[PDB]
Amino acid sequence: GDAVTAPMQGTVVKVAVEEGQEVSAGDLVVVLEAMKMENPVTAHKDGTITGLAVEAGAAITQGTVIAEI
Amino acid sequence: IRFCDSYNLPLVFVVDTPGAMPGVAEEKGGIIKRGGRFFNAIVEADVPKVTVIIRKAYGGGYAVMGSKQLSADLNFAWPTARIAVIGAEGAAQLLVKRFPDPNAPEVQKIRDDFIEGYNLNMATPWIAAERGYIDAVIQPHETRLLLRKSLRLLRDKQNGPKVQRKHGLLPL
Amino acid sequence: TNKTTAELLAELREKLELAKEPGGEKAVAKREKKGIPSARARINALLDPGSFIEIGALAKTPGDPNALYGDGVVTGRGTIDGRPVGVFSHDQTVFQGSVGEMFGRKVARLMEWVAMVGCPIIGINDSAGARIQDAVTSLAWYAELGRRHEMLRGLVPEISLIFGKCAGGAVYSPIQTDLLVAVRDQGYMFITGPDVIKDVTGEDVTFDELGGADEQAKRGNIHKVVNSEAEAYQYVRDYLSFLPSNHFDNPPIVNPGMEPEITPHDLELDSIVPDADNMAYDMHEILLRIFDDGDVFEIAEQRGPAMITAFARVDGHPVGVIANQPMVLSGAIDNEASDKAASF
Amino acid sequence: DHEAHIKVLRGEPTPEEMAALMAVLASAGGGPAEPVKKERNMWGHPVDKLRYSVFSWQRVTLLERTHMRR
Amino acid sequence: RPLIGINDGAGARIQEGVVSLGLYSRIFHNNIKASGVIPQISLIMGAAAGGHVYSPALTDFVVMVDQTSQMFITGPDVIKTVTGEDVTMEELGGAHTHMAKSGTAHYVASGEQDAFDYVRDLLSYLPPNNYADPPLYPVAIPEGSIEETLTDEDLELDTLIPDSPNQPYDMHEVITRILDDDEFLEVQAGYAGNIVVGFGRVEGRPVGIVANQPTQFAGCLDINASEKAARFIRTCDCFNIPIVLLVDVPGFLPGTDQEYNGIIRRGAKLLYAYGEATVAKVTVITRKSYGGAYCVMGSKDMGADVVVAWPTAQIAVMGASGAVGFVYRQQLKEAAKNGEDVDALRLELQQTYEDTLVNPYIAAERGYVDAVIPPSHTRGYVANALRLLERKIVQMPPKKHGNIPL
Amino acid sequence: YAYGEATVAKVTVITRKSYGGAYCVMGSKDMGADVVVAWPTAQIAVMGASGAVGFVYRQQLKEAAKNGEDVDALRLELQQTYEDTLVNPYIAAERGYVDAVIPPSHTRGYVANALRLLERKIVQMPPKKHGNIPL
Amino acid sequence: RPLIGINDGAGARIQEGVVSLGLYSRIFHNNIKASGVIPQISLIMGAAAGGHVYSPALTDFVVMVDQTSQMFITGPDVIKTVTGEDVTMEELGGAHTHMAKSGTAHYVASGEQDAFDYVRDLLSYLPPNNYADPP
């Protein structure tokens, strides 16, 4: 699927994209603070960021859809 | 020991020794290599090794008379055991080598107090027992039946890992 | 606040520079006062330049604020003539080089290493006495180190360099090894020192009479006496050049195929034996001619001098030579000749 | 310098005769020096096919040594 | 000799009846016999149904082709009949399913020629059989000490670890700098990405890498990563390939589903594999190595032949915020009765714990670390150890086989 | 894997079904089962008769559908013929994958007698350091 | 000879350093050496936490006592912090969980004597080692 989803519960510290930006596989999408790590969540495929759903400082649960590429 | 290992007899060590006999005659007689061969044989042997300490186990006497560090399998001590690097009198003597004034009353008092403290706190079963260098401190009457139980446990001992080769070398 | 990665690496580098002289300035000064090199300087002169890799440089006694890095021994691995070896060297600047727990653990680890790889081990001994503050620990670790010769005896060559007073419990590990080389007037070996021999037995004896290098060589406890540590290192190199690394591998082949025809030196043997049956002669005149060259490398030459035990080469292959020496006691096989031959 | 050189023990060639000689000798060289690519493969080694008595000393000095020698 | 199977077939030929099952049984029996004896490589290049799946499962490496290959025991129609589930063959058994979900495919090729290239790369690391040495390329080693022979690429390791312990780095940056020519053949790259495993060379000599990956689940161990690395280790050890572990593991991944799916039983497979292995085992600790994950990831008493730690290594029972709770719980309770700023007290005690213990030196003092090294030295220490440990004279007690957790 | 590697005595009693790949897993002869016996109720087949007849006699059922026959009744009759002909112990016994078909009451005696025969086994396998079981 | 471990412990003794981890590693390495050499039986008779769980997993049989023994790597409070899941230690690691869900416990005893009876029964079927004759 196109959904980039939060692999861990954590706190959104930074968003590395904007809505409608092109992204390539392995581009950074978000930084989640989980397990005391600034865990990078990255785009799995080339496309365009749509439905950007997360905000700086937001806590999000595992399986939250972050964006659709 | 080599004969007994060759014919698969278990070895029981019964210890009461100050260690190697000191002196120029023993050194010239070869005490270093002969002790080396005693050490070599005891470690080489594959048979079950059980030790009972009765009183003294000082220095190389402790080591060679089936210590756990030299691969003895089960180690017991009577409450009279005394396990140490050197006896109280040898420790006191080097103590008195410094500030040596051996004619004075005060240094004889210092020796007596040192020997008393040493035989209470150092030359005992209890440090070796608390470190697990020996497996148990036992009432002397337990010894016969405890030897039976131990050697029954050890009857099928397999000694390894050992690398098979032509032979072991020994001080010779 | 954590330190940066650069700061952590700088800390490591300065801690390693500390651990190369862990006894500190006063012990460096006392060593220079006696004129001996450090344990590391010794290892670095033995091994091939730059080959030394130290193991456990940062080891310390657990639970001891007064512990010093390395616990009194240097251990590691390197090469001699490009061939792997393990090496340890006693460091008399830390706790007088006495056997602590971590001293024991490090030397045990090294002995297990050389058993696992199958390479020679060289011990540089100068003083590993009992540790005054924890002598029962020293007793236990003398025994623990001793036990691990089980992994090595007849599997890999063991060599002991006697560069100091090997006394007390310290004598029993070296005497297990295959080759003991002592420096004259510097190396000594004895269980009980002169002071205690006096106060127990009443006898008077000197260090040289009790355990001097040439006495222990005549008694056959020492295989070689040399005048300097550099000569000890060269004797070790020459010795190892006749030997495989372990019980399984092959020895090096040196100069095969020399002199394939009968030579004048071969023809000198036809008249080398004296005419009269009572006349003694030097057997080295024969040994220097029947092998590939003059490299008859003699071992324990002082022990039972009616007997020669030496390495030599035949068509480049090393051999052991057992020869009677008619020049000494008519070449009769005495007590020390017998045990020298049996060991060799 | 301790390599063993080619020696012209007798005769004195001109530079062109020396060049012809050395070119021919180099063409006659033995090819690649040694088979350094040779790899250990003990599968089906003859010593494993022998019958050994259960107490045979050749288990140590033949079988084991052949497997372990490197 | 290696056995390559190219698998493509609709299972048993139904008209023949039970004889086809007898031949399947015989094929499987030979795969089991050959297991650990000769390398077995299975290409999947079409739909493999029914009995056709179990032979690949028994071989050592499975290479699948993207879109054009499938494995499944029972087809979508039976699945629909029995469970109601509607699924395509691609969703059920495609290469992506067996990479990312089931952990069965070791590689997912872009096409048939890419699959063949991967198989040839594999064989270039593997010996022909377990009595043979892996093919060793002749490489000109520089002469001199480890310090004297450092390259610029080695010096790039001295600055790689982020200054923050909360910042990840891609462990491939380490792997490719210690390996020859940067060449790493990653195995099973799309599964359990919190651990990276694969083949490379050091001075011409094949090695298996096992490395924690901070960028995925902070590099925690979990069920899937444990099983991935366990079987990779056992394959290397079957075929005499030495292993190098690059360690940056905070612990096991917390969660109820890890316990219910059997993290204890299945994580213990990685302990068993590492402890069984008798090839050369080298450990490089690059930051964290905590607790039970420290024990798992190539500790000294699990038989690691050489353990080195970078200056950034953090070896401890547990993270300092957990440890303080227990080692100072009395003091925190007294301060709570006094009504103090116990939060600032916890911060101060935690900072003291980190400054005292959360470093490489306590393990180096115990001799659990053989040397604390500048990161640039890693390749030299590895190359030295691997050269010396070509033959290791070590042995297990005689047994028919072990009893690994399953 | 575990069954194939095992070198102890391995005895199999088939009571009713043993289909497909599970027949291979559950102690088949060629997986090294020393003695396989089957009860008269044993059913050894590649697959259940409905699937088998859904496959062989496919096309035949489809031209029956094109001719407008009662293909469900034909499918039933084909299922019964397949069950009666093939879904039994005897094709396996004819190929010697079953060593005997026995009255169920004989099971304890057969097992005891086989275990006594197999109490000493030599089985020879290629040399390995260890196997590589799936994990 | 068989080794019986009775396990009941809150992990590594945290005031002691990494030394506890070194001893855990030595114990696990011994379990792996002994695997398939001597029978190894683990009784769980309390909360086994952290490093205490792997030795049972490496032994041959695990007997847990119902409702009074637990095994878990990570405690409920860390689970709560990292995942938000509330779980009791009994749900996380109880004997029922390790029987029915994770497949780690070989028996769930109704009490300590029942656990010992199961262990004695197990041993009665086993030889003392991989080369002795069976009982």
Ligand SMILES: CCC/C=C/C=C/C/C=C/CCCCCCCCCC(=O)SCCNC(=O)CCNC(=O)[C@H](O)C(C)(C)COP(=O)(O)OP(=O)(O)OC[C@H]1O[C@@H](n2cnc3c(N)ncnc32)[C@H](O)[C@@H]1OP(=O)(O)O
């Ligand atoms: C097929 C395969 C098969 C193969 C199988 C292979 C199997 C192989 C197995 C092989 C097995 C191997 C087995 C190994 C066994 C282990 C050995 C046993 C342990 C002992 O056997 S253990 C006893 C210890 N004993 C004696 O022994 C004799 C008796 N000997 C003594 O009783 C005395 O020890 C003495 C004097 C005679 C010895 O000589 P000394 O004692 O060494 O010297 P000293 O005291 O005169 O030196 C001056 C003193 O001044 C003090 N001091 C104070 N301040 C300073 C300062 N600032 N600087 C320097 N010094 C200072 C300090 O105390 C120092 O003494 P230190 O530093 O303590 O040495």
Ligand SMILES: CCC(=O)SCCNC(=O)CCNC(=O)[C@H](O)C(C)(C)COP(=O)(O)OP(=O)(O)OC[C@H]1O[C@@H](n2cnc3c(N)ncnc32)[C@H](O)[C@@H]1OP(=O)(O)O
């Ligand atoms: C223990 C193992 C078992 O029990 S397997 C039992 C039967 N399993 C099957 O796979 C039956 C058929 N399954 C399928 O869905 C397809 O064959 C799969 C594997 C998906 C491939 O599809 P596709 O590429 O479209 O092929 P297709 O279905 O058109 O068949 C092509 C030809 O092959 C034949 N075939 C297929 N499977 C079998 C089989 N198991 N036994 C005997 N013949 C088989 C088909 O009848 C067809 O032959 P034809 O040339 O069309 O007459």
Ligand SMILES: *C(=O)CCCC[C@@H]1SC[C@@H]2NC(=O)N[C@@H]21
């Ligand atoms: C931090 O806030 C405390 C909880 C996270 C601790 C980390 S998570 C990953 C490791 N596994 C574990 O059990 N503790 C470690």
